[PDB]
Enzyme design. Sequence first.
Site, PDB file in Angstrom:
ATOM      1  N   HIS A 286       1.023  -1.321  -0.067  1.00 17.04           N
ATOM      2  CA  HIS A 286      -0.013  -0.231   0.094  1.00 17.04           C
ATOM      3  C   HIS A 286       0.520   1.485   0.127  1.00 17.04           C
ATOM      4  CE1 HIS A 286      -0.001  -1.123   4.304  1.00 17.04           C
ATOM      5  NE2 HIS A 286       0.424  -0.306   4.599  1.00 17.04           N
TER       6      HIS A 286
ATOM      7  N   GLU B  56       0.756  -8.142  -0.040  1.00 19.12           N
ATOM      8  CA  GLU B  56       0.618  -7.040   0.935  1.00 19.12           C
ATOM      9  C   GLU B  56       1.893  -6.569   1.156  1.00 19.12           C
ATOM     10  OE1 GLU B  56      -1.584  -4.935   0.336  1.00 19.12           O
ATOM     11  OE2 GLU B  56      -0.094  -3.425   1.585  1.00 19.12           O
TER      12      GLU B  56
ATOM     13  N   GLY C   4       0.576   4.740  10.204  1.00 15.83           N
ATOM     14  CA  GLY C   4       2.768   5.159  10.728  1.00 15.83           C
ATOM     15  C   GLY C   4       3.080   4.547  11.168  1.00 15.83           C
TER      16      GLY C   4
ATOM     17  N   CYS D 257       3.278   1.170   9.602  1.00 12.95           N
ATOM     18  CA  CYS D 257       2.986   0.246   8.222  1.00 12.95           C
ATOM     19  C   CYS D 257       4.708  -0.489   7.354  1.00 12.95           C
ATOM     20  CB  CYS D 257       2.712   0.453   7.349  1.00 12.95           C
ATOM     21  SG  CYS D 257       0.627  -0.095   8.085  1.00 12.95           S
TER      22      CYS D 257
HETATM   23  C1  LIG Z   1      -0.208   1.669   7.859  1.00  9.42           C
HETATM   24  C2  LIG Z   1      -0.649   2.762   6.231  1.00  9.42           C
HETATM   25  C3  LIG Z   1      -1.159   3.301   6.880  1.00  9.42           C
HETATM   26  O1  LIG Z   1      -0.658   4.280   8.358  1.00  9.42           O
HETATM   27  O2  LIG Z   1      -1.999   4.621   6.718  1.00  9.42           O
HETATM   28  C4  LIG Z   1      -1.489   5.246   5.885  1.00  9.42           C
HETATM   29  C5  LIG Z   1      -0.144   5.676   4.998  1.00  9.42           C
HETATM   30  C6  LIG Z   1      -1.781   1.261   9.016  1.00  9.42           C
HETATM   31  C7  LIG Z   1      -1.670   0.638   9.726  1.00  9.42           C
HETATM   32  C8  LIG Z   1      -2.622   0.535  10.473  1.00  9.42           C
HETATM   33  C9  LIG Z   1      -3.836   0.940  10.668  1.00  9.42           C
HETATM   34  C10 LIG Z   1      -5.352   1.264  11.970  1.00  9.42           C
HETATM   35  N1  LIG Z   1      -3.588   0.699  12.591  1.00  9.42           N
HETATM   36  C11 LIG Z   1      -2.758   0.126  12.204  1.00  9.42           C
HETATM   37  O3  LIG Z   1      -2.258  -0.479  12.348  1.00  9.42           O
HETATM   38  N2  LIG Z   1      -2.459   0.281   7.684  1.00  9.42           N
HETATM   39  C12 LIG Z   1      -3.459   0.503   7.311  1.00  9.42           C
HETATM   40  O4  LIG Z   1      -4.226   1.378   7.624  1.00  9.42           O
HETATM   41  C13 LIG Z   1      -4.082  -0.303   5.969  1.00  9.42           C
HETATM   42  C14 LIG Z   1      -5.649  -0.738   6.710  1.00  9.42           C
HETATM   43  C15 LIG Z   1      -6.486  -0.809   7.764  1.00  9.42           C
HETATM   44  O5  LIG Z   1      -4.779  -1.343   7.822  1.00  9.42           O
HETATM   45  C16 LIG Z   1      -7.853  -1.100   7.479  1.00  9.42           C
HETATM   46  N3  LIG Z   1      -7.966  -1.905   9.556  1.00  9.42           N
HETATM   47  C17 LIG Z   1      -8.368   0.255   8.163  1.00  9.42           C
HETATM   48  C18 LIG Z   1      -9.532  -0.039   8.680  1.00  9.42           C
HETATM   49  C19 LIG Z   1      -7.410   1.183   8.808  1.00  9.42           C
HETATM   50  C20 LIG Z   1      -3.772   0.201   5.075  1.00  9.42           C
HETATM   51  C21 LIG Z   1      -3.766  -0.164   3.939  1.00  9.42           C
HETATM   52  C22 LIG Z   1      -5.077  -0.271   2.886  1.00  9.42           C
HETATM   53  C23 LIG Z   1      -5.767  -0.543   1.442  1.00  9.42           C
HETATM   54  C24 LIG Z   1      -4.560  -2.068   1.402  1.00  9.42           C
HETATM   55  F1  LIG Z   1      -5.496  -2.923   0.361  1.00  9.42           F
HETATM   56  C25 LIG Z   1      -3.806  -2.590   1.624  1.00  9.42           C
HETATM   57  C26 LIG Z   1      -3.243  -1.605   3.565  1.00  9.42           C
END
Ligand SMILES: */C(=C/C(=O)OCC)[C@H](C[C@@H]1CCNC1=O)NC(=O)[C@@H](CC(=O)[C@@H](N)C(C)C)Cc1ccc(F)cc1
Length: 181
Positions: free
Chosen positions: A41, A72, A146, A148
Amino acid sequence: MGPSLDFALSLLRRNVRQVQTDQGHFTMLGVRDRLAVLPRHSQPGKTIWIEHKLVNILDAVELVDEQGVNLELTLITLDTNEKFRDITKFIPENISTASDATLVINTEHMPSMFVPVGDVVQYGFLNLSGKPTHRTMMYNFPTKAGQCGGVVTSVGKVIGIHIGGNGRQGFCAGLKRSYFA
Ligand SMILES: */C(=C/C(=O)OCC)[C@H](C[C@@H]1CCNC1=O)NC(=O)[C@@H](CC(=O)[C@@H](N)C(C)C)Cc1ccc(F)cc1
């Protein structure tokens, strides 16, 4: 210094980098030679910002399983002089669980951050904001935005990359050694 702390710090010093794409801040794992891994992502473009400098990306391979389902992870090959210290032997041959893991994050916003996520269990399938994703594991810790790219680690093993969470639990894409062969 104990050995657990020495291994995580060394990881930070040699292999775990602060990066930014057009999608924001991520933790990058350099594995060997010019080969690193990021969460898919993050969508690395033709260049990526690594710590203090813009680095050219020569190739990006988004990993899918045999059913064509998302894993991913994106493997990137960098245009650099540096070869990463090779940590492939710390990555298990198959996706493996662990007790009392530590998530190592390294971003401009969350530099050199150690997060005690506990036991890491097989999870398998995860639905990522509408994207089905295989080969994940799970820790009952409330990870956040933040984080990931964060590297899941335990007793000298590198077992996953942080990819998502639901407010209560967190999820990593599992690492296997053959991705980096
Ligand atoms: C890490 C990436 C991030 O910060 O996104 C903004 C750049 C996050 C970590 C999540 C956020 C909340 N708790 C965590 O550990 N990853 C994502 O946000 C991820 C989607 C999710 O975590 C879902 N649960 C959503 C409802 C918050 C991003 C993602 C989007 C689409 C995809 F195909 C793959 C990953």
